[PDB]
């Protein structure tokens, strides 16, 4: 199909490991991915060879340091299709990105009686920030609720979007059930509002292109080591318009323009106005490499082996007696699902007995399990290094937990 | 001496670098350390081998992975003579932990009409929290001058502190002057008013043994990338009984204990309530292998040889003409200056061009600058991985410049 998963997976190290003397077969990079050799050696060769401090240090070794990453925020902004590579930040991750809009941009625009829009299926990074700002500064936290195939009561939105609603947070991709939502169009909705639009992308980076001047999204974040990438490294896009008026979030050295103690402080300009202090540099080369990695074999490539991985593994889990699967028919990455009346917890030590990594629990979506009436789900991964084989391993499991157990 | 830098150098693979045709001699670890083998390795050999999600996933790389990272955080507990691992808080740096303590616990204790005492000597990071704090909650931001020795003047504390003064943040050693303060003494005096004490110790923990039990300080901050560690890491330690009544600063995954979208969250215990979303748990790997590197030499070890090339290199820039010193004569670390009427840019674009990196500017430290009536400053630091031999060739250089310039 232009895709090879042998080569693909001759790149990852750990896919080589044992667990329980048994050949890994890890269900869980939407928890995070394994990273390829090609990432990992580019960080540690840049610590071996390259390093010290950025900033635009005088001496060599700094300034090149420097333009490396700055071109690494350049090679992130056109892997999104951001219009500059000043429409970036760097932060630690999808969850630090929402935060710093929630403080920096919800402080100066959400104000005492208006409303953001949220969903029921969100992770936590995109709930709390947002209850944190409602309860600051007196606002109403509005959801817009499901349907019971995973996606989302379009319906619902001539309620929920009125003259008070500031912003919709909205995920991507549904890191439980897979769902994509309908970003374009539910953005030209919020913007017929004057309402800004926060995208939580974390589960869609890896899976197809992303282009955030087609969707017209206000703000975009992802993380790093979902993205096959070093852990403690994400990015935040925001419209450069939206950006330069935006106050700084963290203080301290770099973001500054001038310091004084007895005339105050001004601010340089963003996206470097919200970085403070030193960067994670070695992270920042190592998510370079993961841009460079995932460009390279196409994500139009990957988007057709995990959808094909995907279609094989929901034909194969129709043998499984007493199955429960959640979320839509054409989910990506994701396959949530309970096996009969047994805890996610027990299912989910089986599996790893078995060698199987998925993860089990609540999934940090505490209000979409609500939703099921359940209080956890197992959730298998289905990622571009994943096989037949290994998915041939989680059905087996299946059905012989649900032998075992009944 | 016990130590032996010749064996110390043989673990770092930058030393062996050429800068400009020449041997590269790095005088710049106060702005960044380079990293030893052990440490580079420990997170590579992570990610090629181990890697997985954290909080306690129910897979086995999972569960080993978050073993490893709380025993890291004990590791850094036992390291600073914390009473418990639970007093530590991952952070990126030095920086972030200053914004955490500035957000969540100065929120909370400095009300309108308060006063917060910094020094003229703080770095930007130990500054800018404290000013937009201040800005926020309408209080005043005090500070201790400085001695033309580069020392405080401690007498002005009786002017400083009153009954409005909630804290104190001050740095354990300037990463300009070398100046290491007497915190011990200057904790008594704060406590007495009941203030509370944060202490940065981005440029100590590197140089000694730091016990935070005998300072007494209420909060300690570093950074790994400082400390021969990985970057995007770093240490905040609260006492627990401040550290467990602190708010949340950001909200995300694996910081809570409920979420409901109808019923509000509820938050889990410190530390983890401070940490919100996927840590940086490759840079918490190295950094574990960076503190246990540090500790098998010897801090005092450590001390003895560093403070010996200290003392090596203060004789010899004795015979560079028209050299001004910044700072006392017993510094720890660093060696700041300027030579004759030459701007400090030019003196290390010099210096660089020999193979020698210093660093140049204001070093995020303008009120410092200002106080000594100069723009900039350039600035050697001799580490435990630097030579007689780098000291020698920094002075020639100083001399070559000093005769070519003048
Ligand atoms: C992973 C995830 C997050 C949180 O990302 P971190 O890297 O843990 O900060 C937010 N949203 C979704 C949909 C996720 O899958
Ligand atoms: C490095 C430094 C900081 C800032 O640390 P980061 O790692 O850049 O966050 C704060 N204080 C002092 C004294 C420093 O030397
Ligand atoms: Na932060």
Same mark, same amino acid.
């Given at each position: ?55 635009? &240090?005088?001496? *060599? #070794? ?7 990453m700055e071109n690494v925020r350049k090679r992130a902004s056109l892997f999104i299709n951001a219009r500059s590579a000043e429409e970036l930040v760097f932060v630690?991750?999808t969850?630090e990105g929402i935060?710093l809009v929630?403080?920096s941009w919800?402080?100066?625009n ?27 500064? &007196?606002?109403? #936290? ?25 912003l919709?947070?909205?995920?991507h ?10 970003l374009?169009?539910?953005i030209?909705?919020?913007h017929?509002?004057?309402?800004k639009v926060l995208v939580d992308g974390?589960?869609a980076v890896?899976?197809?292109p992303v282009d955030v001047q087609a969707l017209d999204c206000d703000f975009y974040v992802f993380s790093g ?8 490294i994400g990015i935040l896009y925001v419209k450069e318009a939206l950006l330069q008026e935006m106050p700084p979030w ?5 973001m ?11 601010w340089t300009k963003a996206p470097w106005r919200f970085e403070?202090?030193?960067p994670?540099? &070695?992270?920042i080369?190592?998510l370079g490499?993961?841009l ?39 989910? =990506? ?26 993860? *089990? ?42 032998? =075992? =157990? &009944?």
């Open positions: 199909m232009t895709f090879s998963v042998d080569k693909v997976r001759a790149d990852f190290p750990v896919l080589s490991r044992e667990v329980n003397g048994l050949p890994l077969a890890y269900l869980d990079s939407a928890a995070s991915a394994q990273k390829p050799s090609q990432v990992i050696d580019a960080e540690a060769e840049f610590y071996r060879h390259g390093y010290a401090a950025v900033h635009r &240090g005088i001496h *060599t #070794l700094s300034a090149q340091a420097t333009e490396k630690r991750g969850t935060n929630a403080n919800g402080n100066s959400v104000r005492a009686g208006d409303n953001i829009i949220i969903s029921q299926m969100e992770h936590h990074a995109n709930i709390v920030p947002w209850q944190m700002l409602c309860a600051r500064v &007196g606002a109403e #936290l509005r959801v817009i609720p499901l349907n019971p195939d995973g996606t989302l009561q379009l319906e619902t939105l001539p309620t929920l979007f009125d003259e008070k609603t500031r919709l947070a909205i995920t991709v549904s890191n439980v059930l897979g769902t994509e939502n309908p374009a169009e539910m030209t909705l919020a017929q509002h004057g309402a974390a589960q890896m899976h197809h080591h979902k993205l096959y990438g070093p852990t403690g963290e203080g301290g050295g770099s500054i323009a001038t310091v004084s103690l007895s005339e105050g402080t001004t403070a202090g030193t994670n540099t &070695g992270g080369i190592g490499a993961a460079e990695y995932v460009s390279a074999l196409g994500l139009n490539n990957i988007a057709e082996y995990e959808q094909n991985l995907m279609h094989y593994a929901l034909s194969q889990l129709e043998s499984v007696p007493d199955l429960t699967l959640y979320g839509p028919q054409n989910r =990506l990455g994701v396959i949530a699902f309970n096996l009969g009346k047994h805890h996610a917890y027990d299912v989910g030590s089986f599996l790893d007995n078995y060698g199987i990594a998925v993860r *089990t629990g609540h999934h940090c979506a505490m209000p979409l399990m609500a939703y099921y009436n359940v209080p956890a789900m197992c959730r298998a991964s289905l990622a571009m290094y994943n096989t037949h084989e290994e998915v041939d391993r989680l059905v087996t499991g299946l059905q012989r937990i649900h032998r =075992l =157990l &009944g």
